[PDB]
Scaffold this active site. Structure first.
Site, short mmCIF file in Angstrom:
data_model
loop_
_atom_site.label_atom_id
_atom_site.label_comp_id
_atom_site.label_asym_id
_atom_site.label_seq_id
_atom_site.Cartn_x
_atom_site.Cartn_y
_atom_site.Cartn_z
N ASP A 1 0.52 -0.85 -0.19
CA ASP A 1 -0.08 0.41 -0.20
C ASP A 1 0.63 1.13 -0.04
O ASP A 1 2.49 0.89 -0.13
CB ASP A 1 -0.67 0.07 1.27
CG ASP A 1 -0.12 -0.79 2.29
OD1 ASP A 1 0.31 -0.90 2.69
OD2 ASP A 1 -0.84 0.48 3.53
N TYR B 1 -9.35 -9.71 -1.03
CA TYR B 1 -10.62 -8.32 -0.71
C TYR B 1 -10.76 -9.00 -2.16
O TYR B 1 -10.49 -9.81 -3.40
CB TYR B 1 -9.27 -7.05 -1.66
CG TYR B 1 -8.73 -6.13 -0.74
CD1 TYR B 1 -8.35 -6.45 0.60
CD2 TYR B 1 -9.20 -4.81 -0.20
CE1 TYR B 1 -8.15 -6.11 1.72
CE2 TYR B 1 -9.14 -3.98 1.26
CZ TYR B 1 -8.17 -4.48 2.02
OH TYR B 1 -8.10 -4.01 3.11
N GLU C 1 -13.74 -1.64 6.50
CA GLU C 1 -14.27 -1.27 5.01
C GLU C 1 -15.50 -1.56 5.39
O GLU C 1 -15.61 -2.96 5.43
CB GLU C 1 -13.06 -2.07 4.27
CG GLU C 1 -11.94 -1.18 3.94
CD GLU C 1 -10.60 -2.56 3.44
OE1 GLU C 1 -9.49 -2.16 2.96
OE2 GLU C 1 -10.75 -3.39 3.87
C1 LIG Z 1 -5.03 3.55 2.27
C2 LIG Z 1 -5.28 1.86 2.10
O1 LIG Z 1 -3.52 2.39 3.08
N1 LIG Z 1 -5.86 1.53 2.69
C3 LIG Z 1 -5.22 -0.36 2.60
C4 LIG Z 1 -5.72 -0.99 1.31
O2 LIG Z 1 -5.49 -0.80 0.31
C5 LIG Z 1 -4.71 -2.55 1.74
F1 LIG Z 1 -3.96 -3.23 0.94
C6 LIG Z 1 -4.83 -2.78 3.36
F2 LIG Z 1 -3.96 -2.94 4.04
C7 LIG Z 1 -5.40 -4.44 3.74
O3 LIG Z 1 -6.15 -4.56 4.99
O4 LIG Z 1 -4.78 -5.40 2.86
O5 LIG Z 1 -5.79 -2.14 4.07
C8 LIG Z 1 -5.56 -0.84 3.93
C9 LIG Z 1 -3.67 -0.50 4.72
O6 LIG Z 1 -2.54 -0.48 3.60
C10 LIG Z 1 -3.82 -1.17 5.95
O7 LIG Z 1 -4.38 -2.41 6.46
C11 LIG Z 1 -4.50 -0.52 7.41
O8 LIG Z 1 -3.36 0.58 7.41
#
Ligand SMILES: CC(=O)N[C@@H]1[C@@H](O)[C@@H](F)[C@](F)(C(=O)O)O[C@H]1[C@H](O)[C@H](O)CO
Ligand SMILES: O=S(=O)(O)[C@]1(CNC2CCCCC2)C[C@@H](O)[C@@H](O)C1
Length: 658
Positions: free
Chosen positions: A232, A615, A503
């Site tokens: 991410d 996802y 989410e």
């Molecule tokens: C904005 C963001 O960073 N969204 C991401 C997702 O796109 C996905 F990638 C995910 F990580 C996950 O759970 O897989 O959730 C978050 C994240 O990185 C962390 O979980 C929490 O900071």
């Protein structure tokens, strides 16, 4: 060329099959290709499909094997003690097990190329590893090989890695067949790819799929095109889209909905070893987590996503700054100029850059693409590219100039290092996208942006209202527009977890009644209900009957247009597992009209409980089939980072689910 051996319909029932007489005296030269069609819907923890070994006492480490794990991992071993060589190559999440109740015929092609000194593995038309070595070991030049085996490896007279499954077809060739020839081998895949390595995005990785069925019947998909491995933000990530006009049978070549140019769009093989796998692109701006809705009023398709400035992600985003200044109930994007220690500028109407210390306008403007103009002339910055040539990640200028954007590291004017939400629109159902605009802040000057819930926004049946769920610490923050996304207001709904990646996805149960299903930190999917088209929200309840991990996973949700067992039906897509992101299911729930309760009646397993599922996106196709685009791997696991072509699409009918 002809195969030197071809056999089939072998049942592997925890007892190896000896094919030495048929195969061993046929092996010649230093290059070979193995082509194998096999099923394994109930594999043992670790099992070999094929082996070539020295079975003699004292030579237990002289063998070649193609093996798999019940995690879906595929790999090979190539070992010779006398040569001092012990190769082990593998990739997690490379296999299918079952689809629609039936064992999947996986197509495996392994190429051992002595001339290029490279070992390459393909499964189901996907290259899962390609490894070049300094000292090549031909698989049939291992010292004293005397056994060719299916469903085990014979070591010192005993069966190791006993397999359960079947090998319906196996061929071997005394030649390293070309990538070209490989692509001609017929496949029996239960899935298809929409986005894939080597496509128009040039991203080697994808995550965060969405699907949405438009009123014309066109089906639209969006995704994170992730360049710097599967990480991410901070990273380089663009948002890409593709559509199908034939109920998901074929898909258009992807285009970008949102993209930044500060870094080159490079297809890179991101390292998976324990020293370098956390290498992360650290100076690029990015987009992340998209969501789509269609507007009845304007006919436009609307897409939102998070926007991260250069080097920013959720981990280091300033939580105490929205990046906007309030001046009279209006919000203006703040900017910092090269050399200043504070943000002394704002972007006002018509993109005029204003100086806050003197309330004077400057000779600078921001265009619609958030690019910097001086006296109406485009400023530029030099683009970066990344490479691992030095042995670690390097990010360096590449000689190319691109328009200067306020989200860039090298910009004269830079935004606040925090997270934002942007929207773009399409007038032609995803054939082209407008330039993105930032949404205003909803929780005041001193609170960072909320996080968009990936998937679908919601268009209400009986009005032009549009809703996008977002989350932040301690609440869901629904963004509501009644004017085609021109203006937005929030509707906050408290939730009893702090620090949750909450989410959320919504379904309209009946007119003006919205149920939101969301990820929590409790191991259970939660829900809340609105009965006034998103104005007010109920207390939070939980679904029992589905398990998630403590950290949880995105859950996708739709309201099915047809009755099932005479009742209104909701379909959820999620992993069902307390351990990891695996055991994917669609769960069908029938609505009780008396109280809008839902009885979760059917569970369809997308593949084996032990195979990865993270996802996901689901949508009712215009022909009433269900389309599912999903991450077929554990996207949480630190062992399954940076895998290509694991986001896959399947088509299901309701009769498959019930
Ligand atoms: C904005 C963001 O960073 N969204 C991401 C997702 O796109 C996905 F990638 C995910 F990580 C996950 O759970 O897989 O959730 C978050 C994240 O990185 C962390 O979980 C929490 O900071
Ligand atoms: O009912 S909608 O909210 O417009 C939507 C589409 N419904 C059609 C109805 C007719 C069959 C295909 C699906 C459901 C959401 O999942 C989005 O796919 C949009």
């Amino acid at each position: 060329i002809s195969p030197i051996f071809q056999g089939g319909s072998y049942q592997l029932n925890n007892k190896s099959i000896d094919i030495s007489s048929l195969l061993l005296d046929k092996l010649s030269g230093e290059s070979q290709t193995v082509v194998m069609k096999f099923k394994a819907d109930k594999p043992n923890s670790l099992q070999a499909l094929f082996g070539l070994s020295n079975s003699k006492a004292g030579f237990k480490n002289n063998y070649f094997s193609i093996f798999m794990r019940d995690s879906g991992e595929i790999g090979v071993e190539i070992r010779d003690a006398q040569k001092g060589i012990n190769y082990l190559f593998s990739r997690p999440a490379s296999l299918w097990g079952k689809h629609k109740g039936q064992a999947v015929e996986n197509t495996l092609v392994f190429v051992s190329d002595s001339k290029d000194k490279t070992y390459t593995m393909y499964v189901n038309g996907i290259e899962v590893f390609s490894e070049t070595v300094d000292t090549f070991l031909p698989i049939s030049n291992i010292n004293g090989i005397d056994k060719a085996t299916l469903g085990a490896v014979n070591r010192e007279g005993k069966e190791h890695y006993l397999a359960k499954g079947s090998i319906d077809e196996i061929s071997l060739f005394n030649k390293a067949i070309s990538d070209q020839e490989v692509s001609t081998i017929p496949l029996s895949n239960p899935f298809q790819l929409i986005f894939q390595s080597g496509d128009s995005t040039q991203a080697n990785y994808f995550r965060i799929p969405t699907l949405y069925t438009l009123s014309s019947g066109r089906v639209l998909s969006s995704i994170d095109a992730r360049y710097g491995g599967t990480h991410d933000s901070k990273s380089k990530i663009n948002i890409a889209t593709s559509y199908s006009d034939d109920n998901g049978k074929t898909w258009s070549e992807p285009i970008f909905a949102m993209k930044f140019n500060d870094y080159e769009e490079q297809l890179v093989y991101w390292p998976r070893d324990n020293k370098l796998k956390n290498s992360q692109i650290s100076g690029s701006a990015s987009f992340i987590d998209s969501s789509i809705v269609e507007d009845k009023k304007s006919g436009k398709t609307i897409l939102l996503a998070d926007v991260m400035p250069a080097g920013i992600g959720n981990n280091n985003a300033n939580k105490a700054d929205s990046g906007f200044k309030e001046i009279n109930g209006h919000y203006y994007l703040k900017l910092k100029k090269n050399g200043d220690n504070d943000f002394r500028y704002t972007v006002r109407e018509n993109g005029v850059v204003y100086n806050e210390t003197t309330n004077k306008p400057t000779n600078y403007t921001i265009n619609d693409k958030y690019e910097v103009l001086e006296g109406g002339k485009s400023l530029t910055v030099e683009q970066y590219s990344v490479d691992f040539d030095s042995g670690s990640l390097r990010e360096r200028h590449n000689g190319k100039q691109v328009p200067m954007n306020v989200f860039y590291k090298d910009s004269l004017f830079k935004v606040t290092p925090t997270n934002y939400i942007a929207m773009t629109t399409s007038q032609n159902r995803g054939e082209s996208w407008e330039q993105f605009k930032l949404l205003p802040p909803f929780l005041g000057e001193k609170h960072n942006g909320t996080y968009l819930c990936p998937g679908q926004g919601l268009a209400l049946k009986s009005s032009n209202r549009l809703i996008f769920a977002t989350y932040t610490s301690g609440e869901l923050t629904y963004l509501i527009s009644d004017d085609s996304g021109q203006t937005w207001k929030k509707s906050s709904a408290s939730i009893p977890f702090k620090n949750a990646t909450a989410e959320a996805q919504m379904v309209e149960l009946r007119d003006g009644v919205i149920r939101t299903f969301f990820r929590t930190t409790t191991g259970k999917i939660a829900y809340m209900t609105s009965r006034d088209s998103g104005e007010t929200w109920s207390k939070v309840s939980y679904i029992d009957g589905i398990q998630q991990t403590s950290y949880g996973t995105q859950v996708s949700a739709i309201k099915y247009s047809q009755l099932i067992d005479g009742k209104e039906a909701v379909i959820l897509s999620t992993p069902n597992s307390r351990s990891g992101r695996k055991g994917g299911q669609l769960v069908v729930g029938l609505v009780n009209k008396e109280d809008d309760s839902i009885d979760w009646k059917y569970h369809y397993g997308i593949d084996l409980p032990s195979y990865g599922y993270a996802y996901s996106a689901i949508t009712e196709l215009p022909n009433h089939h269900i389309g599912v685009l999903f991450e077929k791997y554990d996207s949480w696991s630190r062992n399954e980072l940076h895998l290509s072509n694991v986001v896959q699409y399947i088509d299901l009918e309701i009769n498959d689910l019930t």
